From Swiss-Prot, chains A, B:
<feature type="disulfide bond">
    <location>
        <begin position="3"/>
        <end position="29"/>
    </location>
</feature>
<feature type="region of interest" description="A">
    <location>
        <begin position="23"/>
        <end position="43"/>
    </location>
</feature>
<comment type="subunit">
    <text>Forms a ternary complex with IGFR1 and ITGAV:ITGB3. Forms a ternary complex with IGFR1 and ITGA6:ITGB4. Interacts with SH2D3C isoform 2. Forms a ternary complex with IGFBP3 and ALS.</text>
</comment>
<feature type="disulfide bond">
    <location>
        <begin position="15"/>
        <end position="42"/>
    </location>
</feature>
<comment type="function">
    <text>The insulin-like growth factors, isolated from plasma, are structurally and functionally related to insulin but have a much higher growth-promoting activity. May be a physiological regulator of [1-14C]-2-deoxy-D-glucose (2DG) transport and glycogen synthesis in osteoblasts. Stimulates glucose transport in bone-derived osteoblastic (PyMS) cells and is effective at much lower concentrations than insulin, not only regarding glycogen and DNA synthesis but also with regard to enhancing glucose uptake. May play a role in synapse maturation.</text>
</comment>
<comment type="similarity">
    <text>Belongs to the insulin family.</text>
</comment>
<feature type="region of interest" description="B">
    <location>
        <begin position="1"/>
        <end position="19"/>
    </location>
</feature>
<protein>
    <recommendedName>
        <fullName>Insulin-like growth factor 1</fullName>
    </recommendedName>
</protein>
<feature type="disulfide bond">
    <location>
        <begin position="28"/>
        <end position="33"/>
    </location>
</feature>
Swiss-Prot record, chain C:
<feature type="glycosylation site" description="N-linked (GlcNAc...) asparagine">
    <location>
        <position position="783"/>
    </location>
</feature>
<feature type="disulfide bond">
    <location>
        <begin position="3"/>
        <end position="22"/>
    </location>
</feature>
<feature type="disulfide bond">
    <location>
        <begin position="200"/>
        <end position="213"/>
    </location>
</feature>
<feature type="glycosylation site" description="N-linked (GlcNAc...) asparagine">
    <location>
        <position position="598"/>
    </location>
</feature>
<feature type="disulfide bond">
    <location>
        <begin position="216"/>
        <end position="225"/>
    </location>
</feature>
<feature type="topological domain" description="Extracellular">
    <location>
        <begin position="658"/>
        <end position="810"/>
    </location>
</feature>
<feature type="glycosylation site" description="N-linked (GlcNAc...) asparagine">
    <location>
        <position position="69"/>
    </location>
</feature>
<feature type="glycosylation site" description="N-linked (GlcNAc...) asparagine">
    <location>
        <position position="796"/>
    </location>
</feature>
<feature type="disulfide bond">
    <location>
        <begin position="180"/>
        <end position="189"/>
    </location>
</feature>
Amino acid sequence: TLCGAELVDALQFVCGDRGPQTGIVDECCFRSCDLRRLEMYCAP
Amino acid sequence: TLCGAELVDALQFVCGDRGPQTGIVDECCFRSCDLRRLEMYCAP
Amino acid sequence: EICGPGIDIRNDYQQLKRLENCTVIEGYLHILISKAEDYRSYRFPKLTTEYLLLFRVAGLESLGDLFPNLTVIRGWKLFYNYALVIFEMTNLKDIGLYNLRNITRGAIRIKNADLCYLSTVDWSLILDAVSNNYIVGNKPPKECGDLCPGTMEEKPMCEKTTINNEYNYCWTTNRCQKMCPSTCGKRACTENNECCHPECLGSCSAPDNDTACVACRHYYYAGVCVPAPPNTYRFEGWRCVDRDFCANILSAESSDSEGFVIHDGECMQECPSGFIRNGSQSMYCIPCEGPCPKVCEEEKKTKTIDSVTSAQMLQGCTIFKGNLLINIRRGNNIASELENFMGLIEVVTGYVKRHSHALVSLSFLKNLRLILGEEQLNYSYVLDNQNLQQLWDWDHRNLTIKAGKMYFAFNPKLCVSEIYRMEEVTGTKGRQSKGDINTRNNGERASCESDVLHFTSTTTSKNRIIITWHRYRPPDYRDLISFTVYYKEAPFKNVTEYDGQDACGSNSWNMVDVDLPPNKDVEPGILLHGLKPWTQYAVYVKAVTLTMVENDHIRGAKSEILYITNASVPSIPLDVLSASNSSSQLIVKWNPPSPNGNLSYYIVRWQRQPQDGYLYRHGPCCACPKTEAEKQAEKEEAEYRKVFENFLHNSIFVPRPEYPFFESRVDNKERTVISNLRPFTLYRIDIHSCNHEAEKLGCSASFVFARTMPAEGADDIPGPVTWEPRPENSIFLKWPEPENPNGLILMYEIKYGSQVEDQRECVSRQEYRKYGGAKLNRLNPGNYTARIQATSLSGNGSWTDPVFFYVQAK
Amino acid sequence: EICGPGIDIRNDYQQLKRLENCTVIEGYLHILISKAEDYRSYRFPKLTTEYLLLFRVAGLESLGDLFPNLTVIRGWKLFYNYALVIFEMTNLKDIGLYNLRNITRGAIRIEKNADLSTVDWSLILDAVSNYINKPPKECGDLCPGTMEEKPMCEKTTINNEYNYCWTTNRCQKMCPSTCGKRACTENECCHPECLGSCSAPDNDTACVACRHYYYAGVCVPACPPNTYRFEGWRCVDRDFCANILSAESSDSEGFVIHDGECMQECPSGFIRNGSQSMYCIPCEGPCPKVCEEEKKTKTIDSVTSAQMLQGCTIFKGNLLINIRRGNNIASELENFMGLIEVVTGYVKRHSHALVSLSFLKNLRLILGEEQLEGNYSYVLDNQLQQLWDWDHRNLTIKAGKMYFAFNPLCVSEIYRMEEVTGTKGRQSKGDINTRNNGERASCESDVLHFTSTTTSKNRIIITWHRPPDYRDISFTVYYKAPFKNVTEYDGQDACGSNSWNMVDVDLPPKDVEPGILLHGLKPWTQAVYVKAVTLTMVENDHIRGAKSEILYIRTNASVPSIPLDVLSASNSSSQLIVKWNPPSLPNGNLSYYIVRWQPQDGYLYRHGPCCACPKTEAEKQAEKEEAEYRKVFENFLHNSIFVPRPEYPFFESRVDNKERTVISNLRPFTLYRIDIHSCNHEAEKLGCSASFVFARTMPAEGADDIPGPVTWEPRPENSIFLKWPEPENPNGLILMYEIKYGSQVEDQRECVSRQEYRKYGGAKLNRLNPGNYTARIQATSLSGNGSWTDPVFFYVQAK
């Protein structure tokens, strides 16, 4: 489970500073997700 | 819904003077029952 | 420079540069640009129709120098119900948008870091129903410290206006918020307090001028604000352009259609609902019957339905380009799955063709009407498919293939009657060879010409059917063996035998069995047990027989669905309710009783329930006490407290495993009132749902009750109290009894005392009857006062008139 | 008059009369007798062996004159686990079971009542641990003795509760030092064989209840020869035990004597020899009950009818099967028709909801005492493949001729039973005819071999080599299988049950070989039986068909992939355990886990509980008017924003395989990017497992506190230049350096920045009074400040 404003700092960690309505707040938070698909929301 | 000590007064009232973890309390209280099957448990 | 459809500025502040070629966005604006490197180094004054998302842009404290001259968002489309959403932004301290006068379609959604200049902004003038806004969570108003020109500390500057009694001065600390005054109002406004063009909303490049309207209320066609021109179509944006522009755009993010088909006089991606594209041109559209859910076509032209998921991709659409080949071998009761999946589809530019036994008929396709047939396999065909039986309900859904050809061989349960004769219905008479729709194998199983058994006798019971039928006598009587009496709760003629057979045939007919007698004199007569309550019960007796010798030539047997509740009769009512609406009255209701029949009326049965002589002779923790999560010992208390009602409550008395009664026949209205009742008495109102044959087989299976509201007047004493002197400083009290005391005067309250009548007691009805009232004692010689109240069964009565009495020492 | 099999006193107080002829109830005694009419007007001293119900008995205030002489509720049988439950009784004010001495089996449950501490239930029931009631404050528990009367009843103490009694009318007594565990008598002892009580000291024939079985007027420990121990209190002769046929609690037509007792049934693995209660024959297959149903004949054409038999073994009739409607009901019948072990007749048609009768995995054999017309004890129109899994379950039909026609089920399944089941010629060759039987389905079907088993990252490109006629297409590559115990009919499609995941790709027209792609194969698993679906007609019965072998493409699934549920946790200072889980996606056989761990920047460097006291937030739905509104904001934000986007070195360690590990020799206090990498069988070949979790090493204390003391030095303007040494390897970073100082004690306190400190060589106090003073200094580490420095008793001067 990972959503809310904590999920915004969670995407800050997985993406670092490198750079149909169901989203990451409707999946990582809804069910459960690791720091692998959480950082799939980032660029290469 | 009808069980507890309230169903003891309920059964005796609808039982005129004719008056395991599953049975009659497991349907009148568990689901819902009227004053027709509640008194069906009663004698003549 | 006029912007193309939408903007998706992404990754870094360097993608803001794209706005340097966007004078009027004709779509949305999306800035996660949280680099904290730039701030106001990306100003685009040119920018002046959808969700303006300004969020997660570390380094952006205000848009005062990011999108200047933001005249008005046309709000053509919205993400939710807003054309500008600033959710908790990394660090936005003022919005900006110092030229935002209107959001036309929609509202805004601006909690936040240090964001201010929102209460001041007249949002009720930017949008109507400012209730759609949610600026309630935005960081406190004490922190706002609004210091926009005038409200800061210098002479008045920013507009002075109000929103629901919020009269204050603006967009940021260094910008104001203008709005339309009496000059124009609903019509746009301009500098020099001048009006805008008759047809204009937002701003005009020149005070009141057709060829100016920065935004334009409707369509700024070729630099002219038109309400709706030569070969030009109401463009979905802010400007307008000729038909060519539409027939030219093939895709552009918000843009998608190859040659934006024109209709509604609009240059829109597609036509509105109820018309197909005229050929492949943006000239107009073709009025049809809602062929517009969406262009069903998929990138992959060709398409099949070998899985329920393969079918679901085509769900919710009309014009597919390619085919709907059905290959679904397995799918438990997918009749309903495919009803929705392969259904809304109307046209297919290819065909609809193999090995499928999960759906018992192609009626799932309910909207499929014609098949363009653009592509071919070449068969535009059925082979090795069985369960399917009836194709596209040809009696309730004709279907043809603009370009077609049939083929039907090796298809056991699929009947040959769905094509041999229906070639006429599918306009395919000679689009193929007769050896294609051959007899060899084609229809070896199926229902075939199955005869129709007549129901010799059709008996009745309180809840049973004894349907019997002519002892079936097929080519050989040894071939025939058993019989099934399918049955289903169904009081509608709109029911067929393949509605719900067994798994592949779907599931609805409950099915049952009985063996046909070997004796030819004796005939078959099932004893269908327990028919379904308050429902007729359809009863089609199919001869589920075996096959041999003839095999495919076995005709079969299936008596028609004779919809036998005359075979049922009066039974127990349900959801009976009652509550005393008024004194000597008792309202009664009865949610349609759920009575093995068709209700005729509700016999009511009630009586003055006699009374015994026992009473005659007589979290937010602001104040949280106990919220222990250890109430499981209470469930342990209800362990045998519940299993004792599963204990002797089961097999002691076998559970069937003073006053007269009065009646009335409620026509059928699910309501009534028992008027002319005793002032206050309980009423066992036994609902009796008298059905069609209640006079013959008893009036239903008997309830609910209420106490008639206490008729005020009989509650209190029916008069005053009289006093008489008595010895020992005593005073004999006296009072009358009510005529019909509500239930009964349980106690006779008494009130007495000189200065105040604090001292109070109550006499028994018994003592009162023998005395006349009561007797007092030790009453200080001097003037005094008394009283009595009639404490009724329903509740206390009312004190009598003053009883100013007196006693003497001698 | 030993009552006989139990009592169910019901309806009225007039049923109590029957206890007149009840000396010992060899069963239960259930009392809804709501009638104040009578109360103690049904005294039966006679009654002196299972549960006793007491509830809804309006009028009963004490059983002192209802069941006097109650020796011991033997408690043999228990409704739940109690033998005297008095719950919600109409008006029982006293239990009044004065003689109650023991509860040999189970316990009781007296609890919340109308008007019902002294009784030592811990003596009757060894340790009361029962739900022992209506207000104990209202009890007023006072029997002669504990009241003004001098001590009458016996006394005992339990959990520190020394008291004197079942009721205030009679009292209580219990086995004293004389015996204790062994029964007892009025201060004399009981017989070796005797529990509860005896009517005379130490006597076989006096034994009131007997310790085991009171055989014909003598307490025997085991029943004499040609006699058997009635499970209750007495022992009876062989004739009585077997002649008894039924009586409510009694049911066995002759209680089949076994388990060293006249028991209704026998213990695990024992079946009544024919119809002889005398003994039981080792079954080896524990029997829940004789499975027979009142109805001699018995059919299973409904899934509910299958369930009606569930929970039993030896039926006395038959089990015809006719279930036409049913999908995957394989599991339904596995549970329902998978217990019957024997039947005295047969298992018979038209049932397309069964691929095989493997659901009956318990039916070991079939007797045949009852038969049909032409003694067919039969399959017709059932279009079944394997009968009773003959590979691993043989049966026998002692009396029954086979019959197999119109079942397009192999004829070989029954040609095997000719010898196996012993039906060599009970039936004719026309009964098990080949015409129509096994004309469809598939048996001879040739097993094709796999020509290539290419295996990418998540794609099996399985390929093969031609049916009887080449007019036959769709090559179902049915896939699914961590184990090698799988067939083809586990769950075909609808009629054949469902489990094998159907897939499909058409065979290309002679050059070009078929090559399906099971793209998206289960990561971490392999089965791939490539059956050939064809057109079965023209040759019809000569159409052989096909069924490729079930290879479990043994390439350890696919290859190395993202680990999962990793749980790194600093278990010690400069240490880091990396316990994880067998990932959800190792994609192989979990070979080892390369831990990979390594920017501490300098940003901080330069820097009802409480009754009446909280508030009512019961309006949590109104608090969710902005909380659920927060979730609406979530949709327009968490579906569209970064979707557009689609200092130190590293060190590694290949963990053997065990979930737990450790990462020692780390920095005093630093966060680590403790990545996990399940490098599997072919990681060197196909990449090493898609990479994590982070955790801060526990602070190695010593750098938390200041390593040395302080040097106070006099300075002008009444100043005092303090000093201190910098922690060598601080726990993360010494953000600030606290400084305590003051006259009497170190009253005041401040904190000098690490930067200012480095340039000052310490810190400077100011304007302190001329006279004795005291100081100290602390190191505010990233983990947390440690202890202060040694004492710094200083002194200042203005001149």
